[PDB]
Amino acid sequence: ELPEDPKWEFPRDKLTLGKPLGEGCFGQVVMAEAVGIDKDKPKEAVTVAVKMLKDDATEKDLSDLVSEMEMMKMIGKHKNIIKLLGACTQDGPLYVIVEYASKGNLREYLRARRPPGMEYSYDINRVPEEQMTFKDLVSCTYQLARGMEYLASQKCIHRDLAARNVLVTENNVMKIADFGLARVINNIDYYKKTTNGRLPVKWMAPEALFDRVYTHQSDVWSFGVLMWEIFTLGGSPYPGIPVEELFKLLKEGHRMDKPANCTNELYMMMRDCWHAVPSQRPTFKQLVEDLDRILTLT
Numbered sequence: 168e169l170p171e172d173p174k175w176e177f178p179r180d181k182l183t184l185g186k187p188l189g190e191g192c193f194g195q196v197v198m199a200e201a202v203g204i205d206k207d208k209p210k211e212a213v214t215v216a217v218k219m220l221k222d223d224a225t226e227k228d229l230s231d232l233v234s235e236m237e238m239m240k241m242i243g244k245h246k247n248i249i250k251l252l253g254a255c256t257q258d259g260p261l262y263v264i265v266e267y268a269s270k271g272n273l274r275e276y277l278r279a280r281r282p283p284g285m286e287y288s289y290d291i292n293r294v295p296e297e298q299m300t301f302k303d304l305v306s307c308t309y310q311l312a313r314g315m316e317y318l319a320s321q322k323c324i325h326r327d328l329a330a331r332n333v334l335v336t337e338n339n340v341m342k343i344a345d346f347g348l349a350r351v352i353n354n355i356d357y358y359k360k361t362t363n364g365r366l367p368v369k370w371m372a373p374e375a376l377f378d379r380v381y382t383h384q385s386d387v388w389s390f391g392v393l394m395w396e397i398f399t400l401g402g403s404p405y406p407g408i409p410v411e412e413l414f415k416l417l418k419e420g421h422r423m424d425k426p427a428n429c430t431n432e433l434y435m436m437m438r439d440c441w442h443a444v445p446s447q448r449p450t451f452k453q454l455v456e457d458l459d460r461i462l463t464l465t
C-alpha cells in the first residue's frame with residue numbers, strides 16, 4: 168500500500184506506453200507519451216520514459232522502485248540530474264515517469280562515437296555519429312562533477328556512479344541517474360556492519376570494499392573511474408583484469424594507466440580521485456572548480 172502523493176500523481180488514462188528501451192542499466196523502462204505532463208505546454212503529448220516492474224519482479228524490486236522514486240523527490244531539481252515528471256501509484260501498476268533521454272546512456276553514447284575499426288564502434292540508425300572532441304569530453308566531465316556536487320550537497324551518496332548509469336539528452340546534456348543504491352547520509356560515514364555486496368566492484372573505493380563504509384569521498388573515487396570511462400570513449404575499467412583479482416590488486420596499490428585521449432592534468436585529477444585515503448581525494452566542489460578552469464581554457 169502506497170499513500171497518495173497528489174502533487175506527483177499522474178492520471179493513467181493520459182499515459183500511453185510504447186517501445187521498450189532496455190532492462191540492463193535502469194530496470195524495465197519503456198518509451199511513453201504523457202498528455203499534459205509538461206505544465207508549460209498543458210495540451211501537448213510529451214515523450215517520456217516509464218519505469219515499472221517486470222512480471223518476474225521480487226519484493227526487493229518493488230521496495231527498490233518506491234525508494235528510488237522517493238530519493239528523486241528528496242534530491243530535487245538540477246540540470247545534471249534526471250528529472251522525475253510524475254508517478255502512477257494508485258489503482259494499477261506502479262509507474263514512475265522520468266524525462267526521456269534520446270541519446271541513451273553515456274557508455275553507449277561514447278562507444279557509438281568511437282572511430283570505425285575500434286571495438287564496440289557502431290553507426291546508430293546505420294548512419295555515422297559525429298566524433299567526440301576533447302572539449303566535448305571535458306564538458307561531459309564538468310557536467311557530471313556539477314551533478315555530483317549538487318547530489319553531495321543534498322547529503323546523498325550515489326554508490327553506483329558509472330557511465331552506464333548516466334543518461335544523455337537530445338541536447339547532449341549529462342543526467343546522473345539510477346538511484347537504486349543511493350542513500351541520504353548525515354555527516355558521518357555510512358556504515359551497516361551487515362554486508363549485502365550489491366556494489367559494482369570495479370567502481371568501488373577501497374574503504375567501501377574493505378571497511379564497509381561509504382562517504383561522499385567514496386563517490387569521488389567512482390567519479391575518477393567514470394572519468395577514465397569518458398576519456399576511453401566508453402572503455403571497460405581495469406581492462407583484462409577479472410573482478411576477482413581486483414581485491415588483491417587494490418591492496419597492492421594498483422591503479423589504471425592514463426587514457427591516450429587524456430592530458431597529464433586530467434590524468435592527475437583521476438589519480439587524485441584514487442587516493443587510498445578518502446580525505447586526501449578532492450571534493451566535488453574542488454573538481455568542479457578545476458574542471459571549470461580547464462574547460463574555459465580549451
Ligand SMILES: */C=C\C(=O)N1CC[C@H](n2nc(C#Cc3cc(OC)cc(OC)c3)c3c(N)ncnc32)C1
Binds near residue numbers: 196331334
Ligand atoms: C544498459 C542500457 C539500458 O538498459 N538503457 C540505456 C537507455 C535506456 N533508458 N533508461 C532510461 C531510464 C531511466 C530511469 C528511470 C527511473 O525511474 C524511477 C529512475 C532513473 O534514475 C533515477 C532512471 C531512459 C530514459 N529515461 N530515457 C531514454 N532511455 C532510457 C535503458
